[PDB]
Amino acid sequence: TAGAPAAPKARSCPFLPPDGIADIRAAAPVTRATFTSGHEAWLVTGYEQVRAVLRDPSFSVGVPHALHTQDGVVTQKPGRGSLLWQDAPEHTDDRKLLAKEFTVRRMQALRPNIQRIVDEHLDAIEARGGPVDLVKTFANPVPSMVISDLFGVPAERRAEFQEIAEAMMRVDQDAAATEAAGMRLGGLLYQLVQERRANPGDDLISALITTEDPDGVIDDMFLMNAAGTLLIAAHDTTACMIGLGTALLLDRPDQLALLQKDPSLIGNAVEELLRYLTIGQFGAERVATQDGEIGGVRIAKGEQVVTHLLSADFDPAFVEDPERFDITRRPAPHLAFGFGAHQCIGQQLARIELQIVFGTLFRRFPTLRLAKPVEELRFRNDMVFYGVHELPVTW
Ligand code: HEM
Ligand SMILES: CC(C)(c1ccc(O)cc1)c1ccc(O)cc1
């Protein structure tokens, strides 16, 4: 046909973006391409233009196609309180309500909880010795357990929360509301909400229950949608970064050795891991709602746009020598958490989880190493979030 060329996806090097991106970004940071669905849309690859799209409040997240799926069909989505598919003014109002209780202060307060969760999972790995799959024993279970503490889940209920979260982790966030595992999570959340109403606590769900609700928006469905969305948005993504960050650090002993010599670099290292790895691999989707202009290219009403966060995090106009992994950079504002109104709401919590996971993993296991070469690893090449399927490690 006369379709624009396929958006680059192949990687000859598994810790770098797809090979084709650089040449496009440099010549044409706003261009057309054809995505997995067969549809064509704008492909924005340069840092500055990705930020211009994402900060413009007239783009909508209600898109006509699902470009990264085979059939392109946009499935049915959850309602108010789920955020990801809402637009203003409802998105603005619902996010501000959730953010009233889901505060950066509540996220910092979870530090000790996180440290305990991280330490228990490593004592079990330790008690039974190498080799082990880090993905299954550590990267998958830790982030949902963090969230279960966020939600006040008591210890007798954890095994069931973890099993259900794990089934959901295998499903894409876009498909949750129309999959079976979604129903099983719905039933758990309905029940969790009733328990908290009956027995309030210090946790997030208890606080939302009694938050100041002038417009009368908070009912059980809103709460289930918010909790559900927090869990699903936090679990797969943070698990992928744990597994993929671990693999990259294990494959860069020079950067690892810097961190072991000066552990106060943990902050900076986490920022460079996020930039370098930008796990949302295929690009975020928006649709224009009015005519506009990005990078001197006219964008029309109804046109879909894909902001390629990975490509933009490797743009040489953003940082010097982008293909170099260097944990001593001064953090610059990467796009691994997005930008603008829909930017990751859990950014601060995810940073804490990763700082604690990598601080502690390398402090307790300085001899950690791969039990198989990086070319035998199997990467998540076709998944929404990039990472490793398995990460066998020893010490
Ligand atoms: C505690 C963990 C996390 C929680 C609770 C969380 C929560 C969320 C939620 C609710 C949203 C939707 C926000 C909205 O539309 O208003 C979101 C967006 C996003 N999150 Fe997270 N997140 C977590 C961790 C992560 C991690 C580890 C990453 C990436 C490495 C990530 C990347 C994103 C990105 C890119 C977006 C924006 C998508 C877009 O605008 O199209 N998040 N996050
Ligand atoms: C599990 C969840 C409550 C849900 C919502 C609606 C639904 O029909 C089925 C399941 C859900 C899914 C996805 C999400 O982003 C928020 C909440």
Numbering used by the authors: 5 to 399
What does the paper say about this structure?
Cytochrome P450 monooxygenases (CYPs) constitute a superfamily of heme-containing enzymes that are widely distributed among all biological kingdoms; they catalyze the hydroxylation of a wide variety of substrate molecules. Finally, we verified that CYP105P2 is a bacterial flavone hydroxylase, with potential for use as a biocatalyst. Our sequence analysis showed that CYP105P2 shares a high identity (92%) with CYP105P1 from S. avermitilis, and that it contains a dioxygen-binding region and a heme-iron-binding region, both of which are typical motifs of CYPs.
The structure of CYP105P2 from S. peucetius was determined at a resolution of 2.1 Å. It contains 15 α-helices and six β-strands. The putative active site of CYP105P2 is composed of a heme group and hydrophobic substrate-binding site. Although no exogenous ligands were added to the CYP105P2 protein during purification or crystallization, initial experimental maps indicated the presence of an unknown ligand near the active sites of both molecules in the asymmetric unit. A careful examination of the (Fo − Fc) difference density map following refinement indicated that there was a distinct electron density with a bent V-shape. The conformation of this density suggests that it could be interpreted as a biphenyl derivative, which was then fitted into this electron density map. A ligand resembling the biphenyl compound bisphenol A was unexpectedly found in the substrate-binding cavity; this ligand was probably incorporated during protein expression in E. coli. The bound ligand forms strong hydrophobic interactions with Pro82, Ala181, Met187, Leu189, Leu193, and Ile236 side-chains. In addition, the hydroxyl group of the biphenyl molecule forms hydrogen-bonding interactions with the NE2 of Gln177. Several hydrophobic residues (Pro82, Leu189, Leu193, and Ile236) in the hydrophobic ligand-binding cleft seem to be used invariantly to interact with various ligands.
